[PDB]
Amino acid sequence: QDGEALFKSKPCAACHSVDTKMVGPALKEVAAKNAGVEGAADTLALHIKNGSQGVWGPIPHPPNPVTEEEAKILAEWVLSLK
Numbered sequence: 001q002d003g004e005a006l007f008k009s010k011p012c013a014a015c016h017s018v019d020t021k022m023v024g025p026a027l028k029e030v031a032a033k034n035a036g037v038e039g040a041a042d043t044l045a046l047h048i049k050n051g052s053q054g055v056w057g058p059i060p061h062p063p064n065p066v067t068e069e070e071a072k073i074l075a076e077w078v079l080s081l082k
């Protein structure tokens, strides 16, 4: 239940989406790309916690430092989606 709540207080969706896409790829396209990578949360971590670009487009990522606890839960709801 905290998965949706975490993606809420975290406006990651404000820029991300699920079935529309605007600035970044919906958690589905990103969750599908890191689906074959059991270390998805790791890849998504260095991309947010350490900016990221040259992947989904020329638009880089802001400095989004999160705690391994929240990054782990947010990485489980993002990779699990539904």
Ligand code: HEC
Pocket (backbone or CB within 6 Å): 010, 011, 012, 013, 014, 015, 016, 023, 024, 025, 030, 043, 044, 045, 047, 048, 052, 053, 054, 055, 056, 057, 058, 059, 060, 061, 062, 064
């Ligand atoms: C608009 C300013 C954004 C906000 C706010 C957040 N994200 Fe984002 N994200 C955005 C873009 C444009 C992209 C694609 C960049 C590219 O060119 O590749 C992304 C991508 C991600 C990714 C995947 C990056 C990759 O696989 O290389 C993740 C894991 C991701 N974003 C996470 C994330 C989180 C947790 C956010 C809230 C803290 C968040 N994003 C906000 C644009 C924007």
